[PDB]
Amino acid sequence: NKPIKNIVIVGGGTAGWMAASYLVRALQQQANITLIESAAIPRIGVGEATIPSLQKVFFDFLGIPEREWMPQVNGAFKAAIKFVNWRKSPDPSRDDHFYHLFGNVPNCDGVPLTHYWLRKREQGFQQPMEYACYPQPGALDGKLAPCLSDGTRQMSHAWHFDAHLVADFLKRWAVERGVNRVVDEVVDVRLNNRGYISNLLTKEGRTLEADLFIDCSGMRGLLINQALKEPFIDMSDYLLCDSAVASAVPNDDARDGVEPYTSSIAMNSGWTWKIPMLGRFGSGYVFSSHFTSRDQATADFLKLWGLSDNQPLNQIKFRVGRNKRAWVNNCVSIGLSSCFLEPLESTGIYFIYAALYQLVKHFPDTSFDPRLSDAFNAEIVHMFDDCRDFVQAHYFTTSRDDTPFWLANRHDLRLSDAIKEKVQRYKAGLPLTTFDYKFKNFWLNGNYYCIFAGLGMLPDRSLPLLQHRPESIEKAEAMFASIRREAERLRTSLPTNYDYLRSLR
Amino acid sequence: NKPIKNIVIVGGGTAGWMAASYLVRALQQQANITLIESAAIPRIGVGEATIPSLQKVFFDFLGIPEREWMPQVNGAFKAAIKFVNWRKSPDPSRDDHFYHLFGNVPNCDGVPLTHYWLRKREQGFQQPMEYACYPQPGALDGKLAPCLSDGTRQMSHAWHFDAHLVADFLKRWAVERGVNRVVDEVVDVRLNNRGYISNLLTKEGRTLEADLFIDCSGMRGLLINQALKEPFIDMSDYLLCDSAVASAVPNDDARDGVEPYTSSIAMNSGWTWKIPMLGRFGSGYVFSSHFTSRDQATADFLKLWGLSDNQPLNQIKFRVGRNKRAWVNNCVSIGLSSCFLEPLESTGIYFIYAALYQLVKHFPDTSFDPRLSDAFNAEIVHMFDDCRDFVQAHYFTTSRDDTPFWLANRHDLRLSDAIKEKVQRYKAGLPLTTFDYKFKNFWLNGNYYCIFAGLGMLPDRSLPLLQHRPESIEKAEAMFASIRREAERLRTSLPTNYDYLRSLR
Ligand SMILES: Cc1cc2nc3c(=O)[nH]c(=O)nc-3n(C[C@H](O)[C@H](O)[C@H](O)COP(=O)(O)OP(=O)(O)OC[C@H]3O[C@@H](n4cnc5c(N)ncnc54)[C@H](O)[C@@H]3O)c2cc1C
Ligand SMILES: Cc1cc2nc3c(=O)[nH]c(=O)nc-3n(C[C@H](O)[C@H](O)[C@H](O)COP(=O)(O)OP(=O)(O)OC[C@H]3O[C@@H](n4cnc5c(N)ncnc54)[C@H](O)[C@@H]3O)c2cc1C
Ligand SMILES: [Cl-]
Ligand SMILES: [Cl-]
């Protein structure tokens, strides 16, 4: 079986240039790669927060160290997601916030600290879960850096960056290593009798041929959905948000500092993201069209940040769900042309490089053994489903009942059996779980606990086992005190996030 | 909710004393534990090989180091399973053997050495997979120790031991730390209107009461099956063997040495185990009653080892399957009273301490929250199913067609969708996967490859990706050469298994 020789990527967004970079890297020899992107169809223009796997899975694989790509794309640090006004009836006189922190929660004699915390709360302990079980939240309040002045990491973290800059940075990297860039527009996809893609017809009359096609054409899915007619499974019965009004907002970094985390500010009919970096923060009101109008949501967004009726905006709508099959015949969909959940928790770009990782692990020859694509397609479903569960958990758990949108999340969502089971185990007092392993069950006990406890849904009781383990309870107190010590050191030890980034220019 | 106070274990076999030890360990305080065992109903008398998790999960948890319990139970080392006459038509003039080795196979640029080996075999490379991808098989042929004279580990391994001695060793350990032993026989189990166990009536007239009951009564399942009437799911449609004829056989260790591995010698209608230790080896012909008679199988067993018609034997039959629920109301089944697959691959005792681990992780209070047992019961099904897949893979993969029994394994077995999927991925050329994580997918790429390749079922082709990675192919050759070096060092470096064990008395 002859190997793949010519690859064509359709799309010049983040997805296409990640695909181009990764593939040019994975395929040392016998690989000609061409990417074509329409000068007249813009990128989506968002996608600026991430999760920890980005470096280990994507950039490391490219051989691009964190200190090299960060300053090139206005990179900033994301130590958490701060959730604001999610907990219940928004009250401007009450501080309703909680963090979803990255990183592992320690175990004490095989039991997560979360569960010793719950036991204490039962005895009247007032401190919130994440402030007792992690050392860094207080520092986040102080908008400090996730690492020392000298660059030594001090807490688990991901990244923020400029979406357009990232795409451009990879475009340069990829082109430099042999990727052929073509600024042009596909207008016809031709299929042989078998149903495979033979070539693309462009607006300037070019005919592009290839063995393998990567569809990174974004939500229109030029190859996978339209040409190959693979159905998209709409899942707006699982999740309500289908729109966003977004913009970049200037920040007075000198007076207000740079927050080392993404913020999720709950709204009337959705929520608003805040992704800070030097000079400004990306922002966007994610909402459901069925509970508010774009006009109405736009006014809410402008009001939230005190913006003016002249502020140019990025109006977006998106589909929620996944292709029935991500890879069909000789076409692999990657990016918005494949699956999407709303930007809560930031899984979009992870879907890109996780899919690319799976693609290489299932790489075909020109005979396109269906066993390979089927195995690939099944991994995508798992990856997507795991995240859909976690995202959904932010919603049907809410105690907010003040608008139709929150009522609908409370009562009207379709839930997978998988999330039902986890919730049932959680409520019973049981701990949840504590790359290939990461792609696998990426969201652990700690993550679900940050969310559930932040939202004010606690288990029915502490673990029955703990009543037999007074020693263990004692050791846990020691671990709590230790955490409290580290928290204090960091306060006087970490530079401000603002100052640290500036020291990176 | 009041905690559990009184626990009664029924059964004095390996299962009961593992339960008693583990529980007395896990439950520091507020735990009274009584074990009752009928002097007139003997233990099963087998169960003498194990897998690597035994130490980390069971003995370590007890605080009993390997050097302390081994000499107490005639412990020996198990570095592998050697399979003899499994490959095809048995021919006394052909050496048909292969090893299933414990331990991980190295990865080269994210691809297991197994797959680089396959690529070489395609070019005419003659050496067998396990001799190229692991350093220790040749040493096993030489019956060497898995560690240096001084006791430094040199290869991954599990253990062999005397079944009765192990049970007795734990009995002493457990009794010494507060377990109450009662030599007596349960004759009636009394249930309240709710259907929970109130107490046990013994033959001497004792009435035993408790909050929690552990059923370790072996295959009769005195509590779970008979009293509580939980159905046992027969799975002799998944696996054919239902009987064994066993005995201990003296060995001339001075002239023949001690093999550092379990042997699996395929027979006409089953297979025969060889579990060596100092002085003798446990052995047993596992067979299907539907393809040979006990009388016939007995004669085959005696002939295999040159035994005499006077040799006293352990005649066994066993059920294959699992309880519909391992834990029902206030009764947890552990051991042969719960699930069993035939002894191929040695999962029996693993089922014991893995279940005990899950029991403590789901430990109840006296209200017996059904969410706990349901979560427990589901983990048991996963554990069992994963092993049933792996065991089944030894059979429907066989190329032997010389008896009805092998024909039946070839064509007539009921296969899970899970094993079908793995096989399909394997055949396509894809790698398979590479405690809580162990219980999870304990059988990895290497294990399945040892088995499949030993049995002579290879993938349809090498990984398409490798054609683009000449560099990677090169590095793999280096790794192969390195493995060959270590193999040579061990040959001149390891003491004989026989000599090493003797140095332990
Ligand atoms: C509101 C919103 C918020 C998000 N927030 C996050 C986040 O916080 N974190 C995160 O990781 N992800 C996020 N995502 C997802 C993320 O934005 C995308 O995964 C990422 O930006 C890559 O998108 P893309 O390249 O597939 O699509 P696009 O940006 O839409 O790129 C499409 C490309 O295909 C080209 N193209 C299309 N059609 C044709 C044609 N017929 N001929 C030629 N060329 C063509 C276009 O010109 C363009 O270059 C968010 C998405 C949305 C919608
Ligand atoms: C042929 C064969 C080979 C095996 N090989 C292996 C192997 O290689 N590796 C491995 O790990 N496992 C193996 N196993 C499994 C292993 O033998 C068992 O898991 C282990 O020995 C524990 O068994 P048990 O204690 O549950 O049952 P048993 O040994 O049958 O113990 C039963 C106990 O319950 C008591 N009892 C019963 N009934 C009553 C009553 N009404 N009143 C009072 N008391 C009572 C009995 O007196 C006895 O003490 C094998 C099993 C078989 C059958
Ligand atoms: Cl996202
Ligand atoms: Cl077994």
Numbering used by the authors:
A (entry chain A), B (entry chain A): 2 to 435, 447 to 517
Task: Copy the relevant paper text.
Flavin-dependent halogenases are potentially valuable biocatalysts for the regioselective halogenation of aromatic compounds. Flavin-dependent halogenases require an associated reductase to reduce FAD to FADH2, which is then oxidised by the halogenase and O2 to give C4a-hydroperoxyflavin (FAD-OOH). It is then suggested that chloride attacks the distal oxygen atom of FAD-OOH to generate hypochlorous acid (HOCl),22–24 which H-bonds with an active site lysine residue positioning the electrophile in a spatially defined orientation relative to the aromatic substrate. With PrnA, the carboxylic acid and the amino group of the Trp substrate are engaged in a series of hydrogen bonds to tyrosine (Y443 and Y444), glutamate (E450) and phenylalanine (F454) residues; the indole moiety is stacked between aromatic amino acids (H101, F103 and W455), with an hydrogen bond between the indole NH and a backbone carbonyl group (E346).
In light of this, we sought to engineer PrnA to improve its activity and regioselectivity with anthranilic acid through structure-guided mutagenesis. It seems unlikely that anthranilic acid could contact PrnA active site residues Y443, Y444, E450 and F454, as tryptophan does, while remaining proximal to the catalytic side chains of K79 and E346. Consequently, a series of PrnA mutants were produced with selected active site residues mutated to lysine or arginine. It was reasoned that the additional basic amino acid residues might make contact with the carboxylate group of anthranilic acid to enable tighter substrate binding and effect the orientation of anthranilic acid relative to the catalytic active site residues, thus altering the regioselectivity of halogenation. Mutation of the active site tyrosines (Y443 or Y444) to either lysine or arginine had little effect on the relative activity or regioselectivity with 4. However, the mutation E450K not only increased relative activity ca. 8 fold, but also enhanced ortho selectivity producing 93% 3-chloroanthranilate (4b) compared with 84% observed with the wild-type PrnA. Following further mutagenesis PrnA double mutant (E450K/F454K) was found to display a 16-fold increase in activity compared to the wild-type, producing predominantly the para chlorinated product (4a, 54%). In order to rationalise the effects of the selected mutations on the activity of PrnA, X-ray crystal structures for F454K and E450K were determined at 2.4 and 2.3 Å respectively.
